[PDB]
Amino acid sequence: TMKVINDPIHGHIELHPLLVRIIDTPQFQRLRYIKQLGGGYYVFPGASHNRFEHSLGVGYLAGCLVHALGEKQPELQISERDVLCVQIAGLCHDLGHGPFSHMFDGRFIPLARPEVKWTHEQGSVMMFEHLINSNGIKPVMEQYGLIPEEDICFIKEQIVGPLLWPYKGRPENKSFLYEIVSNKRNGIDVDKWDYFARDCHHLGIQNNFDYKRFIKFARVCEVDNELRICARDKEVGNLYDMFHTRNSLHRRAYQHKVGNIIDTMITDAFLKADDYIEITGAGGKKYRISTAIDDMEAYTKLTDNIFLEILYSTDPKLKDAREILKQIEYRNLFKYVGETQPTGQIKIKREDYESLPKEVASAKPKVLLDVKLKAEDFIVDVINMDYGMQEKNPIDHVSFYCKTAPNRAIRITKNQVSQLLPEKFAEQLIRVYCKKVDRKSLYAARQYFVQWCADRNFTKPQDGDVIAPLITPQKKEWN
Amino acid sequence: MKVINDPIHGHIELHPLLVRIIDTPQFQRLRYIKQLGGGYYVFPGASHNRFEHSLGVGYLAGCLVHALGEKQPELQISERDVLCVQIAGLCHDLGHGPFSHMFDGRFIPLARPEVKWTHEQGSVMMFEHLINSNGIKPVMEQYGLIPEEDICFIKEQIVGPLESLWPYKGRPENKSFLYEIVSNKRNGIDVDKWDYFARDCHHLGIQNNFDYKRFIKFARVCEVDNELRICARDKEVGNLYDMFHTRNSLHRRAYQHKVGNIIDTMITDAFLKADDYIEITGAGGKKYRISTAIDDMEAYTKLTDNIFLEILYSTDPKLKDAREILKQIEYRNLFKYVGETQPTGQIKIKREDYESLPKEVASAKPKVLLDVKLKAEDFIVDVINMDYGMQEKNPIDHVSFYCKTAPNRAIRITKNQVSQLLPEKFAEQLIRVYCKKVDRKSLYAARQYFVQWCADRNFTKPQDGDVIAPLITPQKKEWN
Amino acid sequence: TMKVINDPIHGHIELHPLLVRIIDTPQFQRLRYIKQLGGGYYVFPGASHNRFEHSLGVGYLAGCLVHALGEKQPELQISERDVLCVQIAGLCHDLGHGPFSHMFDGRFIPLARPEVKWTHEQGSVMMFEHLINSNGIKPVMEQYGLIPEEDICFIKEQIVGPLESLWPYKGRPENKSFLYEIVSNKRNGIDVDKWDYFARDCHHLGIQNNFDYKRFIKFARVCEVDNELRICARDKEVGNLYDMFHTRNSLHRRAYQHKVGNIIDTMITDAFLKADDYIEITGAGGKKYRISTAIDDMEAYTKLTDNIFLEILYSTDPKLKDAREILKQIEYRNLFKYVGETQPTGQIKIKREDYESLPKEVASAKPKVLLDVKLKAEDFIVDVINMDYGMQEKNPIDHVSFYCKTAPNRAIRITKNQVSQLLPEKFAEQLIRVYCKKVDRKSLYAARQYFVQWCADRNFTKPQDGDVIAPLITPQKKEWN
Amino acid sequence: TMKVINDPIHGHIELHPLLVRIIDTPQFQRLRYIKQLGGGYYVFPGASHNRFEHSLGVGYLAGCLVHALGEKQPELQISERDVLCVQIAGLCHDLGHGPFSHMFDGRFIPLARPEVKWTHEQGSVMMFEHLINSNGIKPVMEQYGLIPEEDICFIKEQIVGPLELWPYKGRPENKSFLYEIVSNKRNGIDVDKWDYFARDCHHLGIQNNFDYKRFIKFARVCEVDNELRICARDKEVGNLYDMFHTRNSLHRRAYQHKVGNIIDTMITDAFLKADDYIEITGAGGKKYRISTAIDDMEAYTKLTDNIFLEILYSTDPKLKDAREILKQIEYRNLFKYVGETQPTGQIKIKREDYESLPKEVASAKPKVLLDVKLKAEDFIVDVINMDYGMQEKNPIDHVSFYCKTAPNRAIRITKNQVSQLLPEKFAEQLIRVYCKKVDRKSLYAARQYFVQWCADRNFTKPQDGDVIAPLITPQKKEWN
Ligand SMILES: Nc1nc2c(ncn2[C@@H]2O[C@H](COP(=O)(O)OP(=O)(O)OP(=O)(O)O)[C@@H](O)[C@H]2O)c(=O)[nH]1
Ligand SMILES: Nc1nc2c(ncn2[C@@H]2O[C@H](COP(=O)(O)OP(=O)(O)OP(=O)(O)O)[C@@H](O)[C@H]2O)c(=O)[nH]1
Ligand SMILES: Nc1ncnc2c1ncn2[C@H]1C[C@H](O)[C@@H](COP(=O)(O)OP(=O)(O)OP(=O)(O)O)O1
Ligand SMILES: Nc1ncnc2c1ncn2[C@H]1C[C@H](O)[C@@H](COP(=O)(O)OP(=O)(O)OP(=O)(O)O)O1
Ligand SMILES: [Fe+3]
Ligand SMILES: [Fe+3]
Ligand SMILES: [Fe+3]
Ligand SMILES: [Fe+3]
């Protein structure tokens, strides 16, 4: 018999016994102890929510969309085997997030182990494998009409993409299934739909996107010898508004100036603690925080706990790390100086991130300073805001249909919709913070920053005339 | 005080003066005029009326002004000022006609092209009539108001100045910020917007993406060019662009909905045909028509959405033409939507030319075999200006800001200082074409005329263009 | 192709072309011009909502429940014909409400025409018939696999119950009795009509709703009970079901029976009574009908909506001056003043017969206090209100069937004692509100003295404000100390 | 300058710098790592929320109510000193909850240390003292016009009641109403309840049926027995009974959920087995156990929900028993629910007897021969008191009311004056029985023992009784 569970976002979800069996494992219940928004909780006090319930919701919506397409179009021959596989993918899609979610794969691992190219998705695949094997799920999958050989590939492929037609999990006549959980084509997936609704509910922001409606106007059509999901022509407006809502949530919440500084501070503390924390892995081998990603039995035990483990410890080897975390409780955070963007089409490459603190200290502002500041005193945080496909417009990669010809797929350009849409679909934000908190050093930092902006032909800080009044007239372009 | 439970704002308190204004035929009239006019016939939640909107705007006016006063005693905002602002907010949409914006936006312009009339002008006149016919002046005095000065101040909040130096007679320059609460002439950020965002969304079935409460917490008065004006915090600039995005989005989805607009035009059409034969008793018994009731307020008091059902239920054969249009709305034989398009380059379609556009569509000679030829009277062309409230201008360039480090120092934030993902332009035109003939044969024809007319004038390709007129879209070199 | 419509309560509903065809008729679109809560809008300024959108929602939820039972239990053999019929019933279930909804069938018609036993439901049946015939729907029903003979009966029967211990229904057999429990549940009162208006009225009123209809649907199930297949809820839901009827009673207390909402209802009713004689409405073949007689002809009743309020208000006919003056008094807010509320004691039920006489009794009281003014019986209004759990004195949960996790086909009963000691002792009571037509300071004081005496005179409960309003009278009663 | 913070329940709260200074301490930020609903998260997956944000909201609402009374009634002379003190009390009121909130003070401490009478409130007082002293707050209180001698007593007194005629040393009798805001000893109507109703509902997935904002608009201070206390308007009496109904309803659906409670008992069980082998560093480095950390606040500061994962992740073999219970929660091999029952007549089960009830269930001799016999250690009996917050009393009989006609005159409203459909009693007991042995054979047995035990003690028939134990239910004459 089905099991019913009450999510505050989606209401009463039914869970197929196979799903319940996957959910009730240490690998999945692990997600109860990892917050969705990482350090965001320390700015938005509503945002206590964890991956566990997000993972449930994504599984649910995956089920909704695939099941809806099947009702709408029997010709597709979507089996309850396909449905289950899509649900399972959705359910397990973020199994591989680290402590504090995106802080881990986005800040920490890149710093701790620059050699590796590792993502939360790759983790999810490996963790899924470990979940299946350590809990004897293969027999249960068979019991409910699945074929582990084919289907475990199909599930993995939904999550990370592919391990001519690149997929071994399903044929070309069911390519639409790959667009549900994690849409490689345009980015419109149920992952987004859940976290919009969920993050908004818990943050204290209202969500401007109706996933239910998009489902009612979704439909599979042939596009280039392949069956893919298409939206109705009228929905094009709502789809641009979906990616606006995404970018807006990043601006207000996910990339919040203090949320990000807390993320960097927690990352900093992890880096200092990494050497002295051991985690028992497979066959008892000892793994560090940074190396737990290599073994899943170890990574199973690596959660937000590691924060409090560091905070509460008395090991003097951890004193450096513990002091950073104590500074977060007391709220002696590194101080925000200002924000800026590049101009023209000057993209700042990732390689150069290391060097930018040096450049800020190196500026010679024509103003008398009390204090000189070294490059180690500065933090520069570079942030790429986009519409999910770097410089591309994702709507140019969406297929549409008309009321008059619902099997005929078409394209809608930007010009066909509106002149009030974005000109570009990607940019960079550069936040500068200063490690020295005091009145004297903050004034100095501001002068260095606003000069550095003029030095590199960046945009004038919004507060620029106030914070560095002596420096802003210098630039001819700012008048 | 009197407490009243609005579903949007919760439990509002109402000052006895306000209650006394509310309980008048001129104000209770707003119970019988829907917010979204013909929108109710597309969004079945949107039953809501001006009455409750008017309450909410009054409330939020009170919130903002009272908040500024707490935050900044130096401004010397009196409870007299507060009441006046509340009253303005309360009465700000007293002058909407039947079906709200349909009246001042479609009907009056067609019925009486000579007049320049707006719902605001109506509100001023209706306010005057309310005060005089209900003996409010004594009550205003009783609660510390000065009718001479203050009734001007209230009117001025609603319509702007009643005539580069200081244009207002109601209040001096050191209280200019008060004029920015109810109806903000500078940039358009007002509590009118804040209520109807929340309200329309609640009733429509759309979620609202703008937090008015938050903006209030980061609002503040500063000196700007020898004048004290409301300023928002530097960080809020993002949310302010998102306010006008939310506005434009609501127009796209709801207010300018293709069918909502065709129902508006159909009701307007029926009013035009009924205008000659409907009398409304005015002041001293003089007889006024639907189009002329705006001249007298005693008559206009009785002019509400009722006029729809009056026409529908009538048996006067003089009204048969009008009644038949309205019966066609019940049965849902609406004029059929053909498609939408925009001009290209910077080709603005002037208002003057609106009359002529049906002629142009019929005039197109599509290279396709048609069953039926269609005359210009068969077409309706509906031109819609979508903007950020200041025609082609960026309203954020007309907002003043402050910093945490210097909260009395006002500043400007340009577009470039915020984001590269903002809109390039801040106004555009949408051209919807509909056909009066509903049948399968005439609709196909209409589509061919339309898609040709688009290629003929170098307009954008209709989104559905390759489907509806497959033979015509390859013709244009620019569409490949 | 289906048509999609965005209701703020239920989201994006799909509408089957047959339903759309029924919706787009003058008989149905009529419901756009009748408010859900009648005079409640004049107290809760959110409550602008109309029957139209309620009717949509009830149709939708009817579809949800029946479609859900079918997925859960294929053995029931619920056809898409059955589904459509249930949706249509739900959609059309309140087609027959009058102007200001329950004011019409509940106050006005009983006063205007005491001879008739008429309800909004009976109206809906007749109006449904008129809708079908005047719009040629029968052919369209056939086109989508319905059988008008059988099914139009089934639809009517869902709305009003049986059209007259054997099986009473001619529309469907006993093996599909569960279908009759969806739209309007004669057994216990748990229906989708309630579920919509809870959610809807709350949304528009400014009150939060404490009942989850979606959840009850997930734990609904058909079982055999006494040679008949009926809907049963899971044993654990029993708590939520008592809370459903609590939520109902709570909404009546706060909103539907609000002291001022009711006085405005009586005032509008009063104005209609005075206007009835002089308002004509064109009916079938042009025959002239009055407000009170429009219920006899549906072509006339089609044109009878909340409009009739504004028609009276805006008129200049001097025959309507009495009616127009009452309605003008509502604009200006010179309402009849509330004096207080009371209940009977013991097991003293006040019969409907006696309602006429109660104003006489209040004036007749001789309070031992010096009054400036004597008041006549015509000056008083007494409004008697029956608050119940939908089955007069009965506990509706004693008429619900339940199932267990361990035996989901075996139906059972759950008594009150098996659930909780904190449940209600009784399931019906009476509320008596007294108002005075004379508004002034002097007459209101007098009215209060008459009322609080009348309460002591008939061994009713002490008014909550009693010691304040009539301080000289409350010590008189030995039972109040 | 004030600090603004965005709570999803209450919106944008302003925080006074003194409050911010209290919030940013290890003693307060500790509450980020303690869930509101303890083990409820393992049944309601929305309920991730923690005490931290609850504590914020209670502080906020405390501010709202006290500030509202002050505006409504200047005669009370409520100082911004009083306001701050009330806010601080509200903010810090649940500073002393243990790991998994009510599991700690309600299940664990009573079992681990039966000698002590300890509550989360007593903890909050001690933790407040530790917060103030370890962070040098006293100087800051003085800086914002407080008097630490008087006011720190007043704050503590708000939380726990009197620290020893008028019982309070913190404030005089003419400000007794202030003690009714944060934690209302008289009737239980406090802002603590108002927040968690709204908050728990938001996160659980249940809609809340109580409007705190409205009650505030109709709240008022009147004299009652030589003392100034908060009174509600006569009409609100209905809503107040509905407040305590909503409370009881939330306990039934959520807080006392059969599985939520079994997970609480299982976590408690694991803590008991782990208690001996877990050390926590306290003041001057002294070693404290989980059960003894309550004696020292420096230790208790580090005692949070963490202790769950500490046990789960450990490899110490001394903790193997505890770790195995917690692993059984992940895998979902929970102790199985057998059924629920209530006593009859006026048979109250005293707390003393709780220990003995498993013995009694095993001791029942059900007249059908059972293939496995079960020992008393195999059973868990969970006794739950559901009340209206004052044991057997009606809390509305301890509320004061006022009338529109006489707003300074306080009165009483009995049950009979309101409704015949109200509850007959205001307290009852629920007895849940679970079995530690999970298997098919032992569960059948357990059911037979339970349903017999019910008939043996003249308890109510289990709702599922005829199904689970069909052979036993006809035995009882009273069940037919
Ligand atoms: N048909 C109908 N639609 C309504 C009603 N109320 C709101 N609507 C909405 O208005 C939308 C569009 O109106 P329609 O009558 O369908 O006009 P259309 O969409 O241009 O035309 P078709 O879809 O071809 O019939 C519908 O899809 C409904 O969601 C109603 O009473 N009847
Ligand atoms: N101080 C503090 N702020 C919090 C906390 N939790 C969330 N916040 C929010 O985080 C926001 C910003 O963090 P702050 O600590 O104020 O950092 P900041 O604003 O950059 O620094 P200041 O302006 O100097 O206070 C605040 O407005 C709060 O609403 C907390 O525990 N302490
Ligand atoms: N229980 C309730 N919950 C929420 N709102 C209510 C409730 N009862 C009434 N309202 C609404 C209707 C109005 O918007 C406002 C005032 O109603 P109410 O409390 O009955 O006072 P009232 O003005 O009718 O009587 P009074 O003159 O006795 O204050 O609150
Ligand atoms: N754009 C936003 N919309 C809604 N809520 C927000 C937004 N930004 C922040 N919040 C929330 C998170 C915080 O709890 C609160 C205040 O945050 P924020 O406005 O960023 O001020 P801050 O304290 O971080 O910087 P500052 O010290 O400059 O005010 O509101
Ligand atoms: Fe995800
Ligand atoms: Fe307005
Ligand atoms: Fe109904
Ligand atoms: Fe609390």
Author numbering:
A (entry chain B): 114 to 276, 284 to 599
B (entry chain C): 115 to 277, 283 to 599
C (entry chain D): 114 to 277, 283 to 599
D (entry chain A): 114 to 277, 284 to 599
What does the paper say about this structure?
Although the HD-domain contains the active site, dNTP hydrolysis requires assembly of SAMHD1 into homo-tetramers. Here, sequences at the N and C termini of the HD-domain stabilise inter-monomer protein–protein interactions and incorporate four pairs of allosteric nucleotide-binding sites, AL1 and AL2, which regulate the enzyme through combined binding of G-based (AL1) and 2′-deoxynucleoside (AL2) triphosphates. Using combined biophysical and X-ray structural studies incorporating nucleotide analogues along with mutagenesis experiments we have now discovered that SAMHD1 uses a bi-metallic Fe–Mg centre to catalyse dNTP hydrolysis in a reaction similar to those catalysed by HD domains in both human and bacterial phosphodiesterase PDE enzymes.
In addition, we determined the structures of two co-complexes of wt-SAMHD1(109-626), also in the presence of Mg2+, with (i) GTP (AL1), dATP (AL2) and dCMPNPP (active site) and (ii) GTP (AL1), dATP (AL2) and TMPNPP (active site). dATP was added to the latter two complexes to stimulate tetramer assembly, as dCMPNPP and TMPNPP are poor AL2 activators. Further investigation using inhibition assays revealed that all dNMPNPP analogues were actually competitive inhibitors of SAMHD1-dNTP triphosphohydrolase activity, with inhibition constants (Ki) ranging from 0.78 µM for dAMPNPP to 0.052 µM for dGMPNPP, with the following rank order of increasing affinity: dAMPNPP < TMPNPP < dCMPNPP < dGMPNPP. The resolution of these structures varied between 2.0 and 3.2 Å, but all structures contain highly homologous “closed” tetramers of the SAMHD1 catalytic domain, with pairwise root-mean-square deviations (RMSDs) of <0.5 Å across all atoms in each tetramer. In the active site of the dNMPNPP structures, regardless of the nucleotide base, it is apparent that the side chain of Asp311 of the HD motif not only makes a coordinate bond with the bound active site Fe but also acts as an acceptor in a hydrogen bonding interaction with the proton (Himido) of the α,β-imido group of the dNMPNPP.
